[PDB]
Design an enzyme around this catalytic site. Structure first.
Site, PDB file in Angstrom:
ATOM      1  N   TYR A   1       0.573  -1.424   0.207  1.00 52.16           N
ATOM      2  CA  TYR A   1      -0.004   0.071  -0.427  1.00 52.16           C
ATOM      3  C   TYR A   1       0.542   1.381   0.225  1.00 52.16           C
ATOM      4  CZ  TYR A   1      -4.265  -2.824   0.748  1.00 52.16           C
ATOM      5  OH  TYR A   1      -5.237  -3.533   0.966  1.00 52.16           O
TER       6      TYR A   1
ATOM      7  N   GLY B   1      -1.848   3.344  -5.102  1.00 50.08           N
ATOM      8  CA  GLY B   1      -2.652   2.752  -4.701  1.00 50.08           C
ATOM      9  C   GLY B   1      -2.135   1.670  -4.211  1.00 50.08           C
TER      10      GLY B   1
ATOM     11  N   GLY C   1       2.758   3.826  -1.421  1.00 48.81           N
ATOM     12  CA  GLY C   1       3.130   4.129  -3.380  1.00 48.81           C
ATOM     13  C   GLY C   1       1.913   4.035  -3.402  1.00 48.81           C
TER      14      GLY C   1
ATOM     15  N   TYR D   1      -7.562   9.238   2.953  1.00 44.35           N
ATOM     16  CA  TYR D   1      -7.086  10.064   1.569  1.00 44.35           C
ATOM     17  C   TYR D   1      -8.634  10.005   0.558  1.00 44.35           C
ATOM     18  CZ  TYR D   1      -3.559  12.566   1.169  1.00 44.35           C
ATOM     19  OH  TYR D   1      -2.129  13.905   1.670  1.00 44.35           O
TER      20      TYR D   1
ATOM     21  N   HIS E   1      -3.885   5.264   5.126  1.00 46.21           N
ATOM     22  CA  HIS E   1      -3.747   6.347   4.846  1.00 46.21           C
ATOM     23  C   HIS E   1      -3.987   6.850   3.756  1.00 46.21           C
ATOM     24  CE1 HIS E   1      -1.281  10.053   2.747  1.00 46.21           C
ATOM     25  NE2 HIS E   1      -1.437  10.365   3.910  1.00 46.21           N
ATOM     26  N   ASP E   2      -4.155   5.722   3.000  1.00 51.05           N
ATOM     27  CA  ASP E   2      -4.641   5.624   1.366  1.00 51.05           C
ATOM     28  C   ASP E   2      -6.444   5.953   2.160  1.00 51.05           C
ATOM     29  OD1 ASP E   2      -2.348   5.441   0.684  1.00 51.05           O
ATOM     30  OD2 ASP E   2      -2.697   3.510  -0.512  1.00 51.05           O
TER      31      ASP E   2
ATOM     32  N   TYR F   1      -1.300  22.236   2.968  1.00 54.45           N
ATOM     33  CA  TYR F   1      -1.967  23.157   4.170  1.00 54.45           C
ATOM     34  C   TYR F   1      -0.764  23.405   5.319  1.00 54.45           C
ATOM     35  CZ  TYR F   1      -0.290  18.088   5.149  1.00 54.45           C
ATOM     36  OH  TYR F   1       1.331  17.228   5.161  1.00 54.45           O
TER      37      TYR F   1
ATOM     38  N   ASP G   1      -2.171  12.943   6.959  1.00 54.00           N
ATOM     39  CA  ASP G   1      -0.613  13.212   7.314  1.00 54.00           C
ATOM     40  C   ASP G   1       0.354  12.533   8.705  1.00 54.00           C
ATOM     41  OD1 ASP G   1      -1.133  13.398   4.144  1.00 54.00           O
ATOM     42  OD2 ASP G   1       0.769  14.986   3.901  1.00 54.00           O
TER      43      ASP G   1
HETATM   44 CA   LIG Z   1      -1.177   4.216  -1.269  1.00 54.59          CA
HETATM   45 CL   LIG Z   2       0.063   6.187   0.621  1.00 59.80          CL
END
Ligand SMILES: [Ca+2]
Ligand SMILES: [Cl-]
Ligand SMILES: CCCCCCCCOS(=O)(=O)[O-]
Length: 124
Positions: free
Chosen positions: A28, A32, A30, A52, A48-49, A73, A99
């Site tokens: 994960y 996608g 990277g 987002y 994190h994905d 931000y 983040d």
């Molecule tokens: Ca990813």
């Molecule tokens: Cl990521």
């Protein structure tokens, strides 16, 4: 913004090399990602994905037209302590935390060189 993300990580994990370190890692970390995360770290990126993913579906980010990595931000760093400035508006604050939490996560997850540049087609 991504640059801020790399910066944020360099703050929580001093001698870090964000991109070299966290890209193409696990299934994960990277662009996608799918399959079962390979370890605590790969899980940090999965989270994190998803964060987002919620971000784009956020009413507060309705005017944000591109990927959260393009949303700039306001954050500050002190003693490897990441703070998301209150001057941030809704969407920013949110993305700032996706983040922050990731940096913190990254700093507490083991790093296994064997899970780097993993063959995704074969193990994800
Ligand atoms: Ca990813
Ligand atoms: Cl990521
Ligand atoms: C496979 C890696 C894709 C992303 C590469 C870095 C893109 C952003 O570069 S930046 O705007 O100076 O933070």
């Amino acid at each position: 913004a991504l640059w801020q993300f790399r910066s944020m990580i360099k703050c929580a994990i001093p001698g870090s090399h964000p991109l070299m370190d966290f890209n193409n890692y696990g299934c994960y970390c990277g662009l996608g990602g799918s399959g079962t995360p390979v370890d605590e770290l790969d899980r940090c990126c999965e989270t994190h994905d998803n964060c987002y993913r919620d971000a784009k579906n956020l009413d507060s980010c309705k005017f944000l037209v591109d990927n959260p990595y393009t949303e700039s931000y306001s954050y500050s760093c002190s003693n490897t302590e990441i703070t998301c400035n209150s001057k941030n508006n809704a969407c920013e604050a949110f993305i700032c935390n996706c983040d922050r939490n990731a940096a913190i996560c990254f700093s507490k997850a083991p790093y296994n060189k064997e899970h780097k540049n993993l063959d995704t087609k074969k193990y994800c």
